[model samples]
Target: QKGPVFLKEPTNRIDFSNSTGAEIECKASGNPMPEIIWIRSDGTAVGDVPGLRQISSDGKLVFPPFRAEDYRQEVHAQVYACLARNQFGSIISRDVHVRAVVQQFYESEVNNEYVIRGNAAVLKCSIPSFVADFVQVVSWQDEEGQLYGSLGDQQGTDGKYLVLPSGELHIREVGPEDGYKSYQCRTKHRLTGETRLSATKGRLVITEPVGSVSPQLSGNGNQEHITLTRVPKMGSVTLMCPAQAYPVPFFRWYKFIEGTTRKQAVVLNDRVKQVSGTLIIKDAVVEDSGKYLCVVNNSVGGESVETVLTVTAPLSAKIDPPTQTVDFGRPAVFTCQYTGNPIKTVSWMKDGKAIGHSEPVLRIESVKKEDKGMYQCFVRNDQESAEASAELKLG
Candidate 1:
């Protein structure tokens, strides 16, 4: 009544499993600054209780001197009461029952973990039912044998080693050397004064993504070009441009024309596919035969290789959609499809008069009635020549 009010009445019961020490507390507040006193249900004062126990000035009770073997016994399980007193009057709070049992002292156990270089590291330590009043201290020891916890006083946080309140030892950035040894967790009981250590080895397996390594050419030759890969028509062949890198390399095929400075990129289509560091050509034909190049790139850099691909075949040429009708003033385009071991020249002609266009496709701008004529494509290879024609009519 007139004196103190109980804020935290000693619990009805406290579970101290596998614990060496424990605390039973009583909290009260009053205008006159009340004080608390603990006593047994039978009227025995807490200070007078058997075994090594302590009673704080604030009326908090500490358990028997934690004996590792006998700490698990229920002898600590006894009735307790808190009395709040002030200059005005005193009041008795509720009674509480407390006991201890055999159980695990360490809630933090070592478990396997995977880590990579330059990444964050978490060496966890924790208690299952960590009651604030029961645990004395929590700490961490890294593979470096550095102690960390209760920072600034125990161990400074400025260092890479950080002892987290969760019982986990954390490193802001895991270094390569962090995995050489073992990190450990240490815990002590409040009243029992028992301390334990965990080996917790191999908790970290350090790894990192592969770094760059450039590509190396194949064969013992001058390394200038890939050798001839001559296959029959409708056949398949793979040109390899292997590389060395932490990560695998990707490939893009190219072709260096014999007479032109242009390095034409070989785009993928129905007959071709890039497989890792190699280019695969299926159903190889005369048109498929040419100077093929391989460009391999990874995280590091890019490398390239070239080869002469010769397909033993004769020259053949034809114009696609040969019979064409075009609307006046529209652009007229014609494609000359060709098959040759080496496509030397493909020229277009109108009514036996040579047109300037030499590429496989002939393009005409601003088609008109005067532009209507018979167009032909003549293709020549190193071996021979072939021709096809188409007549353009104004629609």
Candidate 2:
């Protein structure tokens, strides 16, 4: 059995603007019922103050409609206390002071120029008052109620905004179309039930030329012996085919195979489209392997580059220490390694069951007797149909 207790306490600060009325509840648990009382800082008993209504249900005191008026008259601008008593002893909470002023403010503003595709634009929002609480919600919406960008939504996708502890919102890679859009940011109190709302409306219009000087390739080393990262099978990868011309240059992709008299090329499938200046591949397979040529041409001139795609199997894997054996309750390490033209993934499996893959090493923390089995490592390259696997044994 325990004595009476106040479950809600006035937080560090109170919000006076748009006051929705805060509440403080008193609760108690004991073998026998307990009596609870409310008092003001001056030692005046407030158990029966008008507008300060208290409803006790199942050993809990609920102050319904704990509004500003109730606090203004009995507790506002003054300290209040909740006192509980039982056969064990009497307990009183420290005097809590209430305020009638603004505690925090959230303000969002636009910064820098929202350029075309070349440079990134930025939108910033901040809670300039406190330096602790996190930005609870942030969203960017257009005039049609379409959400162009957001943070912490049901999709669980992280936005380009770099959130800082000081409550600042930074929109990275801001496109020209984002101009003239409305953005809103809401900050909730970490401890208290207070909130700060801020908003800004504007369109991001970049008047710069949409086309660049010329299309160029960006990757390791020169055009030859390009160390392309391997993409996984059934997974998508994108390559940029940019160009320059009087009018916007048209882009196309082609493929070349070995021992083929004619340069056989795979045209960019309509399902796989070009976004901005880059090409997007959807659900890549081994048949998608070969040299990928990005060609752009217009009335002015034409430029082209060929990237080889070697598609392997659908499974990419890696194992550490190559092989090992361990006793019960001990640790065992397996490393799987896979590589392809574009970059592929390395994964580990046991009897065809996946064991999760990310880094090059998979460590079994505690090796039980059941851990002894045949483990296989699988490799998958996005462009080829061939899959490679290596096996290991544990005892």
Candidate 3:
């Protein structure tokens, strides 16, 4: 072929302080498929690094969102170049200048957020307009000293609060108790060891929903009569019923037996309890699958809501014997015992490669020396897959 040719090259300079992070991209093409790499101006190759920096397969060098301590003269303020090589020839790109700036002052803003009860609330931790590009959110803290991180949007241990990226606190189901709770955000400068809290506490103002509403499934539309909930066997599930009224209404739960419309009162025990207007079922079994009714009554009127619950068994598979030694030229049979709510498919693999088998029992008329290896059985359902492997040896 042909020699490597540069299609695109990095710019002359990249300022780390101008943005949260920076990147350098160099692209090339050749007849023999050239490999692209990054090197310093002093002719040192840059390897792929996790978290701090990354060299993607597309010949782009990436610097992820950095911490204040990550900035350095040798790494952040340096010159870099791209090199492309193939069997035919090699090509080097022009040097690129990367610069970093350190900030002296820190600034942040947190404002009051208004939300209605039973609705979601997002409390934002905004940065100053001038330093918005380079500042990174560290974490969040509530008035009670509860800490939330920026790892990902995840539910808090209490199940009501969530931490989102870029310094935002999410209240999934805002309740009356959440009103007037103050929250603060922490931030740091990417190129300097300076940290700052919000200028003022961000408070939540929870207001009542427009009007009185009947009891219904939490977070569901009014017209939807029946909701569906699925849980694995031996797991727990909670059904929430929320209603807006002057005084809290009395809660009652009922279940329809078999396929009839007649409702019977649900028996409460340790495994099944009614916590206020919610129904909690722990260590659920197959018999727990059915339609459940939640009825609430007050001085004015009464309303009912229905939900269908399905408890599925966990998917699991096991190969019989685990290891079997078969005589040469004899029939070998391996059985896969799998259990799941709905096993969609049964697949077989030989030596980690797919084979022409789709049955629970994998049988070979005659075993050869080459066939004496590891065999795998895979059972899958809609949500998960279970795998089991066995070793076959020659006697």
Candidate number achieving the greatest lDDT relative to the actual structure: 3
lDDT of 3 by residue, 1-395 (tens): 34455667665557665236778898877666877778885868877566667876566888776666766567777777776665443445555777666445666888887555765566778887767756767788877767754533332333555454324566656688777578788887756556777788888887776666444333456464567878778766666555544344677999878888998899988557654456667678888878888888865678887888888886666778766778878887789887767577888767435676887887778987578665667676655555655666677
- Candidate 3 residue spans exceeding 4 A from truth: 1-237, 245-248, 255-264, 281-291, 297-302, 307-316, 327-331, 338-345, 356-359, 364-372, 381-386, 393-395
Please count the clashing residue pairs in each candidate, in the order shown. Answer: 4, 42, 0
Tens digits of per-residue lDDT for model 2, 1-395:
33333343333223232243345554543336646676664777666445444545543333334544345444444555555555544444434454433234546443333344443333445444343333344554445666555454432113454332222334444555556565555556543456555554444555566555443333333652333434556665555432323345566666666657356544545556544334556667776666666667655577676566655443222334433546556667665555444445555555334668765666767876455444555443333211222233334
Model 1 compared with the native: what TM-score?
Answer: 0.33
Q: Assess every candidate by TM-score.
A: 0.33, 0.33, 0.42
User: Which has the better lDDT: candidate 1, or candidate 3?
Assistant: 3
What is each predicted model's overall lDDT from 0 to 1? 0.60, 0.47, 0.68
> Candidate 3's error at 51, in angstroms?
8.8
Deviating ranges (above 4 Å) for candidate 2: 1-23, 29-34, 40-44, 55-80, 86-88, 93-121, 125-138, 155-170, 175-200, 203-395
- Give the per-residue Cα lDDT of candidate 1 at 68: 57
- After aligning candidate 1 to the native by TM-score, how far in Å is the CA of 126 from where it should be? 5.1
